[PDB]
């Protein structure tokens, strides 16, 4: 009979959902790691890296230092889905950002938050059955939401290319409108980035395996 609810099954769908998000996150990671390993001398034409200095330093985010290579890697994590040959156009647009140091900082932060999450979870992708079912669900939701945040930001940056292309809202022919459009875009991205930190901490706090 007689209209039943089942736990072991609810758990299995969450586990399978998790092993799939983790696998797909990991491919994303292998792709941005490769994007750094195979970085051209001109860094895909992202010339903005050469104008972003570490806090009390002449060293740029372009330089050949571990911290500078990670910065660029975490940036590539955020720019990962955009075709590598459009990055120079994206860069040329962002040069006109009033906040490019902050904007590139959120790129990096997003990529790093993501990388920290998949780095934590990847090795545990068969130990997740150890979790209480309820924070398995919280884990699954937080991680799915975190991947989603990163996608939305890559979509927004890809959309900026097309809107510039098409002069959406005069951004291509009126520099003042581009600037305030880039400013709004920074606010939005910064927000996703804060949200991403939260989610990452959620994930870490309840998956101490």
Ligand X SMILES: *SC[C@H](NC(=O)CC[C@H](N)C(=O)O)C(=O)NCC(=O)O
Contact window for ligand X (CB under 6 A) among 29-37, 96-104, 166-174, 186-194: 96-104
Which of 13, 67, 98, 130 lies at the binding interface for ligand X (CB under 6 A)?
Answer: 67
Which of 78, 97, 109, 207 lies at the binding interface for ligand X (CB under 6 A)?
Answer: 109
Closer to ligand X by CB, 71 or 143: give it. 71
Beta bridge partners of 60: 53
58 is in an annotated binding site: no
Find out whether 192 and 155 touch, Cβ atoms under 8 Å: no
Whose tokens are 């006109």? That residue is: 96
Which of 101, 159, 165, 205 lies at the binding interface for ligand X (CB under 6 A)?
Answer: 101
Instruction: Return the residue nearest ligand X (CB atom).
Output: 105
Helices then strands, counting H and E runs in the chain, come out as: 6, 0
Does 108 sit near ligand X (CB under 6 A)? yes
Which runs of consecutive H residues, i.e. helices, occur in 60-173?
Answer: 66-78, 87-94, 100-121, 133-165
Does 200 sit near ligand X (CB under 6 A)? no
Does 161 sit near ligand X (CB under 6 A)? no
CB of 92 to ligand X, least distance (A): 19
Q: Strand, coil or helix: what is 60? A: strand
User: What is the total count of residues that contact ligand X (CB under 6 A)?
Assistant: 12
The C-alpha angle with vertex 120 and arms to 114 and 126, in degrees rounded to 5, equals: 120
Q: Strand, coil or helix: what is 187? A: helix
Does 49 sit near ligand X (CB under 6 A)? no
Contact window for ligand X (CB under 6 A) among 106-114, 123-131, 142-150, 182-190: 106-114
Work out the angle between the directed axes of helices 100-121 and 175-206 (0-180°, nearest 10): 20
Q: What are phi and psi of 129, to 5 degrees?
A: -60, -15
CB of 22 to ligand X, least distance (A): 22
Q: How many other C-beta atoms can be found within 10 angstroms of the C-beta atom of residue 19?
A: 14
Binding residues for glutathione: 71, 108
Q: Which residues bind ligand X (CB under 6 A)?
A: 52, 67, 70-71, 74, 101-102, 104-105, 108-109, 112
């Amino acid at each position: 009979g007689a209209m039943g609810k089942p736990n072991k099954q609810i758990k299995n769908k969450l586990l399978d959902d998790l092993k799939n998000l983790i696998e797909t996150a990991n491919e994303d990671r292998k792709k941005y790691e490769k994007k750094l390993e195979e970085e051209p001398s001109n860094q895909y034409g992202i010339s903005i890296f050469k104008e972003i200095y570490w806090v009390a330093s002449y060293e740029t985010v372009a330089d050949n230092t571990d911290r500078s290579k990670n910065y660029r890697k975490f940036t590539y994590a955020t720019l990962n889905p955009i075709n590598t040959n459009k990055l120079a156009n994206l860069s040329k647009i962002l040069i006109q950002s009033k906040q490019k140091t902050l904007l590139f900082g959120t790129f990096c932060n997003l990529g790093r938050t993501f990388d920290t999450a998949i780095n934590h979870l990847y090795p545990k992708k068969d130990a997740l059955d150890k979790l209480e079912i309820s924070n398995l669900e919280k884990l699954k939701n937080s991680f799915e939401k975190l991947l989603s945040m990163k996608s939305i930001v890559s979509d927004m940056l890809n959309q900026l290319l097309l809107d510039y292309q098409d002069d959406k809202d005069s951004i291509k022919t009126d520099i003042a409108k581009l600037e305030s459009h880039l400013t709004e875009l920074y606010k939005q991205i910064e927000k996703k980035s804060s949200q991403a930190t939260k989610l990452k901490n959620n994930i870490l706090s309840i998956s101490n395996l």
